[PDB]
Each structure stands twice: as C-alpha cells, then as structure tokens.
Amino acid sequence: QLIFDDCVFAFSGPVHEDAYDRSALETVVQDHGGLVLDTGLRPLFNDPFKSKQKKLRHLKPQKRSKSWNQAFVVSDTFSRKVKYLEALAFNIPCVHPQFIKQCLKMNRVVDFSPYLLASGYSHRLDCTLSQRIEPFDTTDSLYDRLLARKGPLFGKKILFIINTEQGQKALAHVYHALALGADVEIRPNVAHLECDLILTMDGPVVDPEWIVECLISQSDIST
C-alpha cells in the first residue's frame, strides 16, 4: 500500500528557521497515504466546549480516530507550541522530521523511538525531560488507544476561575488539563466548592505553568 496508510500527522514549527521543509514533508506524507491535520490533533477528540454546560468531562476520542492506528507530531525539536503541548497531553509521539525520511528509506513505518524528541524543559527541575509513550499496539486504533488512555491527572478535580481574546488562551489550559485526564469545572468564584486544586491564571491554588510542568513530566506534580 502507501506507507503512511493509517498514520495521522501534525507538523509543528519549525522551532528554528529553515530547520525542516514543512511544506515539503507535509506533501511526502500525503503522497504516501498519510493524513495531515493542519490544526493539530484536536480533531481526534470531542470539543468540550460544544455545549459548554456541565461542566466539563475530560476528552473522548471522536469516532473518526477509529480509522487510524498511529499518530505523530513532527517538530525539529521540543517546544511549547500548542500542537506540541497537545501531543504531549494526548501522549502522542513528538518526533524529529528525520523519522519520516527514514520511513521512506525502509519503505515502511519504522519505530519512531530513535526520533523521539525530549518532552521539554522543566523550570521546576531546571532540566530537559524525556517523553514516555505507551507503545503503539497495532491492533488497536487510535480511537481504541486514546480511549483507554487514563491521563496522569486522571480523576483529579480542578476548579478554573475565569471565550474571547485572552479567554482563548485560558481555555487552552483547560483543554490540556482535560486532555491529561482531569475533570475541570469552570467557576467565576470558589466559594465553598470541593476540589483537588484550583487553577487561576497567573502567579490549593496554582497557575497554568503547573499544567505545562505536568505535560512535560507526564505526572501530577502536586503529589
């Protein structure tokens, strides 16, 4: 068939000028049967804010994902670009572009491992960490895999106290929290509510950076 038959791709960056020919690569992948999601990976999941009511249940895989078995985000290196962070959240491999080129050389989808970028840089620890990716069991569709995924923040109940301009960046964080298997509830005020932690923008209670920390270390850094 076509090598990237059942693979979904997203491209991020390049983080560094002319680090890779994104325009070109995107083509190669399409030319070889691969699907290319230009906006990132959100398509593979529900929109939590469709009927943004009660309030809000973590992400579930849209049935479409049943039609593929592998996904990658391509980047020349790790970043905090939103496609990267989304990948990080969904536990999809961020891989260096060479991975694709290698795939064409082996005329097959090779193991992405040797091309697995670090997850990112932690200010909490002042270091770069590694990604940790539940292997692709190629009998389970992305849908299967993505739905069995219990996030690192699975179960955790989060209150976010805040849909226009800045709010978009706010919601981005809620999304990631959700993606990370957590249950977010959006209030204007705390009051007397029950919660595992509270997420206010800027700066118990913590700031979005905490989430990025969780994204990179794939862990509940509060514990």
Binding site: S12, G40, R80, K81, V82, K83, Y84, K169, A172, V212
Partner: peptide, 4 residues
C-alpha cells in the same frame, strides 16, 4: 502556535 504560541510558544511559552
């Protein structure tokens, strides 16, 4: 796509 942002950077942070």
């Amino acid at each position: 796509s942002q950077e942070l």
